[PDB]
Amino acid sequence: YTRVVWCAVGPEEQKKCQQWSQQSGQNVTCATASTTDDCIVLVLKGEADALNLDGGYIYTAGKCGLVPVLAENRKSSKHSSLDCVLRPTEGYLAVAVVKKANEGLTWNSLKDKKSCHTAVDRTAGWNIPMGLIVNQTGSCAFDEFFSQSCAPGADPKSRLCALCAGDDQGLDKCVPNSKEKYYGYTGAFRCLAEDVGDVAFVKNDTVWENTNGESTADWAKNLKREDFRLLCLDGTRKPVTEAQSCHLAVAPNHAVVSRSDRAAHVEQVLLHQQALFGKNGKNCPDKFCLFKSETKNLLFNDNTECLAKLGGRPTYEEYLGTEYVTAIANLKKCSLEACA
Ligand SMILES: *[C@@H]1O[C@H](CO)[C@@H](O[C@@H]2O[C@H](CO)[C@@H](O[C@@H]3O[C@H](CO)[C@@H](O[C@@H]4O[C@H](CO)[C@@H](O)[C@H](O)[C@@H]4O)[C@H](O)[C@@H]3O)[C@H](O)[C@H]2NC(C)=O)[C@H](O)[C@H]1NC(C)=O
Ligand SMILES: *[C@@H]1O[C@H](CO)[C@@H](O[C@@H]2O[C@H](CO)[C@@H](O[C@@H]3O[C@H](CO)[C@@H](O)[C@H](O)[C@@H]3O)[C@H](O)[C@H]2NC(C)=O)[C@H](O)[C@H]1NC(C)=O
Ligand SMILES: *[C@@H]1O[C@H](CO)[C@@H](O[C@@H]2O[C@H](CO)[C@@H](O)[C@H](O)[C@H]2NC(C)=O)[C@H](O)[C@H]1NC(C)=O
Ligand SMILES: CC(=O)N[C@@H]1[C@@H](O)[C@H](O)[C@@H](CO)O[C@H]1O
Ligand SMILES: [Fe+3]
Ligand SMILES: [Zn+2]
Ligand SMILES: [Zn+2]
Prior knowledge:
Entry title: Crystal structure of N-acetylglucosamine complex of bovine lactoferrin C-lobe at 2.8 A resolution
Number of strands: 13
Order of helices and strands: EHEHEHEEEHEHEHEEEEHEH
CATH topology of the largest domain: D-Maltodextrin-Binding Protein, domain 2
Radius of gyration: 19 Å
Name: Lactotransferrin
CATH architecture of the largest domain: 3-Layer(aba) Sandwich
Keywords: C-lobe, lactoferrin, NAG, complex, metal binding protein
Assembly: monomeric
Bound molecules: a molecule of 4 linked components (NAG-NAG-BMA-BMA), a molecule of 3 linked components (NAG-NAG-BMA), a molecule of 2 linked components (NAG-NAG), 2-acetamido-2-deoxy-beta-D-glucopyranose, fe (iii) ion, zinc ion
Distance between the termini: 31 Å
PDB class: metal binding protein
Helix content: 25-40%
């Protein structure tokens, strides 16, 4: 009744949730699935209450009646006077990254190169990039643009999974969850750092968070920003400090979604939950922090300051914005539970 059932995607996320459930005294319990879409089915079924989602999945859920409840908010310099829970969300920059040593690689010479995506159906890792590529290309054969890629979610036998690696033993190749070495923002970036792929479709924050000694992770401790470049849409190549003038798009922050007849309940518990394990919670540092997972973005991106109220009690289309919504629609033209 006053308890929330969260849906975790994959084994690593289920571990962090179990910990969260334990520290909350059952105020929050977990449900597990192997993929985000399965997590959405559980929520529709009623066996799970909520889960945080990238804009790409919100589109999907939205059609199935789910609704955004709260959104993640990272630290910004403008809009200082206002608290985090009430402050407007700015969204993030989807960028295309490359190794600087890869001279001559530009947005115009990407065909047949090797791409690293966060996962199919995600904003910065799939929808924005393949969206632009389907339009400029005029074709729907985005499955043939790149020679080889790693796009968690696609057919394991296809070229779109050729570069993925699976887990420690090579099992779960290409599964859209943290078990895949190259899954998500971090996964896709590693995919480039290790020179597996030629280009990685992530977000501006990912580069910074994993370069210049910010990650301490063995595959990223020796990473230096200067050795990276962004691919702008005009054919130019700018430093990672010029993200504001060289990005593919601004994307809507990830957000917690739930069934509408529960949104109120999910919100109440969450706000309270975050006042205890949030950025400045009564018990985050000492006992448990909802927004930490040592660079893996488990349940929430590690750069989340807090979960913000929406205000305007927005529908999923409104939340995602008309801009992004068409982009997705146009792309989906090329391809219950896809509830319309
Ligand atoms: C692209 O993405 C990057 C990464 O998110 C953005 O860079 C961050 O931007 C913020 C806001 O402009 C900037 O403000 C400072 O935040 C610091 C915390 O990161 C604060 O102090 C510093 O904290 C560091 C982290 O603990 C610490 O290592 C350092 O010693 C110092 O204490 C500071 O008070 C400011 O608020 C961040 O510094 C910056 N973070 C990083 C890692 O660079 C960047 O703005 C994005 N670009 C665009 C176009 O949006
Ligand atoms: C890929 O190409 C498609 C096809 O053009 C792009 O869709 C088009 O997107 C623009 C801008 O979002 C739409 O224009 C808007 O039209 C509405 C009224 O329909 C108007 O009120 C706005 O001021 C604006 O002019 C356009 O309608 C839409 N075309 C169709 C038929 O869907 C799509 O955005 C491109 N995708 C990417 C990732 O760039
Ligand atoms: C777990 O959730 C319960 C329910 O909200 C919390 O207990 C409540 O504490 C507030 C503040 O004292 C009271 O207004 C409620 O009446 C209490 N619930 C009841 C009916 O006993 C509890 O604080 C939460 N603990 C954790 C770890 O999150
Ligand atoms: C114009 C713009 O910045 N795009 C916004 C994005 O920042 C925001 O996160 C999202 C959710 O409302 O809606 C988009 O339209
Ligand atoms: Fe995203
Ligand atoms: Zn822009
Ligand atoms: Zn409205």
